[PDB]
Amino acid sequence: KTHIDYAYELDITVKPDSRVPVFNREFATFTGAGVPLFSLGGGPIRYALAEVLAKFHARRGYYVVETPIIASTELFKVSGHIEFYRNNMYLFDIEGHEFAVKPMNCPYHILLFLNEVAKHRSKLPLPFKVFEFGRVHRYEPSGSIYGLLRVRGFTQDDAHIIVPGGRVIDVVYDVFEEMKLVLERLFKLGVSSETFKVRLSMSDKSLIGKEFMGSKEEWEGAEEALREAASRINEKYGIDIVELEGEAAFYGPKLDFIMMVEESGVSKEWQMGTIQFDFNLPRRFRLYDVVREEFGIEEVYIIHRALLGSIERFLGVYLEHRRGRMPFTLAPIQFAVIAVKTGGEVDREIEDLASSIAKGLLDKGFRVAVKGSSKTGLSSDVRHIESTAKPAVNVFIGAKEVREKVLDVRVFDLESMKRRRLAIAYGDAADAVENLAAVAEELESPVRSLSGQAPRIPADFSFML
Amino acid sequence: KTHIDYAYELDITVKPDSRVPVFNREFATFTGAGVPLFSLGGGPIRYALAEVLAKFHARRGYYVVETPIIASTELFKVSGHIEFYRNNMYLFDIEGHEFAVKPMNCPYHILLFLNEVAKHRSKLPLPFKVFEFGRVHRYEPSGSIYGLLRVRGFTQDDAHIIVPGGRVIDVVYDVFEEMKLVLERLFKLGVSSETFKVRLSMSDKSLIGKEFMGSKEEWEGAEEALREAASRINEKYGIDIVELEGEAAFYGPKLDFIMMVEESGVSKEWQMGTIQFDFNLPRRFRLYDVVREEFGIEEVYIIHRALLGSIERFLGVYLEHRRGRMPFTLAPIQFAVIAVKTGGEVDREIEDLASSIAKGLLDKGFRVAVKGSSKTGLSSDVRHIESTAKPAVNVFIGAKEVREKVLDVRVFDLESMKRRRLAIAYGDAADAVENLAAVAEELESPVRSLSGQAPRIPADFSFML
Ligand SMILES: [Zn+2]
Numbered sequence A, B: 001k002t003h004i005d006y007a008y009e010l011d012i013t014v015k016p017d018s019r020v021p022v023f024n025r026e027f028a029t030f031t032g033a034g035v036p037l038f039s040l041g042g043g044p045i046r047y048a049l050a051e052v053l054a055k056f057h058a059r060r061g062y063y064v065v066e067t068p069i070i071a072s073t074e075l076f077k078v079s080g081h082i083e084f085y086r087n088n089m090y091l092f093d094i095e096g097h098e099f100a101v102k103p104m105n106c107p108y109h110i111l112l113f114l115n116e117v118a119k120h121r122s123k124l125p126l127p128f129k130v131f132e133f134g135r136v137h138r139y140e141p142s143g144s145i146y147g148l149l150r151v152r153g154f155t156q157d158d159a160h161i162i163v164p165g166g167r168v169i170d171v172v173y174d175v176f177e178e179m180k181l182v183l184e185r186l187f188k189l190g191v192s193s194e195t196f197k198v199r200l201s202m203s204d205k206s207l208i209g210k211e212f213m214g215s216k217e218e219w220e221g222a223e224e225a226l227r228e229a230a231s232r233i234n235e236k237y238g239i240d241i242v243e244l245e246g247e248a249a250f251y252g253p254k255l256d257f258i259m260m261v262e263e264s265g266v267s268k269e270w271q272m273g274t275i276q277f278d279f280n281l282p283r284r285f286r287l288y289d290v291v292r293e294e295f296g297i298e299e300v301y302i303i304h305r306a307l308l309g310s311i312e313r314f315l316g317v318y319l320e321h322r323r324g325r326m327p328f329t330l331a332p333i334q335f336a337v338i339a340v341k342t343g344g345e346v347d348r349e350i351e352d353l354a355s356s357i358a359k360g361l362l363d364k365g366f367r368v369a370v371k372g373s374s375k376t377g378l379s380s381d382v383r384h385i386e387s388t389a390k391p392a393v394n395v396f397i398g399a400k401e402v403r404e405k406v407l408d409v410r411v412f413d414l415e416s417m418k419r420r421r422l423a424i425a426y427g428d429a430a431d432a433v434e435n436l437a438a439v440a441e442e443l444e445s446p447v448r449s450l451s452g453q454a455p456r457i458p459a460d461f462s463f464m465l
């Protein structure tokens, strides 16, 4: 099982080689290869993620923005390079004039900086930090396309930071803290000396002025910022730091976030976001001038960062590493309510309790699937549900639950990779719903600390079970 | 003053003819005409709107989805028409194969329907209702472009509904109820017999089979559904109904939502969303077959609906009709905290109170701007703020507020178009923040009823004042 299987099973995406009813042709012969089509299970995950990541960044001091999806190629001519980059871009014509489907957000984010400088000059605080849940498109050859990992259109948790020399170490370190918070609290992935690695890619000093552009002062200023931040990371968590001479991009040095994971029992890297310094953009958009003239600042840095990276790619690796198991906030189905019918008259109270709990949870904003089952069918109903829908929380309602007034409630424990059984007492349906909602609130609690609010985007996904 | 002015002043968008610092060229010579660039004030409005509209639709029973931005033109060949529509589309090549930047969501939404039918057949409920905050691009000539009203890329509160004959009247009526809820609760616009009109556009029966496609049964079934729903609307609200023979689109009849507004003192229409029946799509995507074969249903309807329509367009007209005044949830600046310094030692308590209230509101997730002012400067500081930033709530902190322990708090009343003064007692900073937060919660209350949660996307916009 790959993410491709898990994505189809949880109904996060449409499978490109599934046949369209009545047409019998693959969905991909309508949509194009490499264009992931998110489905009904995937919709709420995408809104929820945007919402959490936007609020998380706003609480950490980033200005959240949404930038256009197309642009004149003048925009990408000014940024560079552009005889090269042209080749990864989808271009088109309006009306003689050349336009592109945006392959990156950076130029737009710098325009927004430039617009605020123009209106407010030095009243604008620095560091200036702008975040976007941004939608980018790039040329990928048909043979390069693979599931959700390499695609033609995808989303990034993209940010740009314009930071003076005196605050740059703290900003780098903070982004690391951001990565760690999102991993631990949204995804329930532990970040520590045993699971995480930071990789620095630096210049070769002999080649500054040629394969690495810019001046020595630039490179040393940035490389030292990455070494100091990395040194604080290592001191606080014992996370190990790797440094590669001559691996930087031509426009500045960088840091990569790497999770260490294991098969089965193979040790592997799972590469995530990045902190990329840029010496090209501040020249091409005259940022050095602007910051010197308006703020009197001579040492400033420009930085691209993503915590997850490509969101599709992150979700893909995540589906595989976690075998389809989503954190509660992002689970297509949050509560699966399972009525275990017996044949007898107790079925009426079972069916009323299940139905009422189901409506109550939906009113509270949860994603809920009701499944009718039986004592003899239960075993194979559950097996089907666990192998496919993987609901975050199963609630079993049988004769026993009705007579004892205790729900049988099974939350999936992401660390142990096992269900854990809770016995939740209730007086009546209303009260069962309150108590289930309380459990959910405990499961949403880490996300509330990132973003203030856990998103409730309700749905009745009964038809999936 | 047009929306173009209000949008620039509230920092919702970048003005295309503003000059880029240091370059002195217009922003538009980088971006392209007709491509609205939302700015820092506009970012949180866009996330907030997506979030509220998505949750509102999920609570009303729509499945929320996000569909790709590009697609093979096979997708638009199957839907029609396509020698015609080709001309409004941005097209491009991958790798020999023709692709388009999506001009509409409909084909994608039908693929998602078809995908669920394939996996779950008749377990899928009907009506099937899918909602998307969707991003669409269309060719518009340079002379057609105007502000936010006619643009090249824009967003819709788009939905598709596949409804059997027996439930179609209720669905039409419900969409109307949706329009009314969003207007009244998100936008604080009254919808009644004095302010609202519903326009039906129908076939000419003599031309069914020619300028209006489909069969008589189709048209009569749909036109009666619109007349019955309209008749219920009129009975419940006395809203007047207008019916035009021969104005329907070639593929089915429709209903348009129209607000009646006034200058100055001219009566004008403000056209909003639509309910469009479609007889073409169910043929082109073989939906009639699919619904008959899988559900045994012979009478079914396919419907496109938007409540706002183009979101950019709606926001534009809104900015003009309300002279820049946003509802609290959508206001770029939610609380403006204004320290009225005196020169004396009381300035220390004024500055500490303002500062603490400001940090406290930010922690609660609000968008906050602090302005330092003086007794002599106040008058012209406020005038500048009211003419430009238009904060939802002004909080004045002067010597008097400190000595009496009562804040001077001015909420803008959207109906009367005037500030209204509240006297809010406090014991200390913490308590002032609780009491301000309570006022905000009262202002967020109508949005909580649409969507369960009012979005808090915080920002420090001090630099704007
Ligand atoms: Zn970038």
Ligand SMILES: [Zn+2]
Binding pocket: B104, B105, B106, B160, B304, B305
């Ligand atoms: Zn449509």
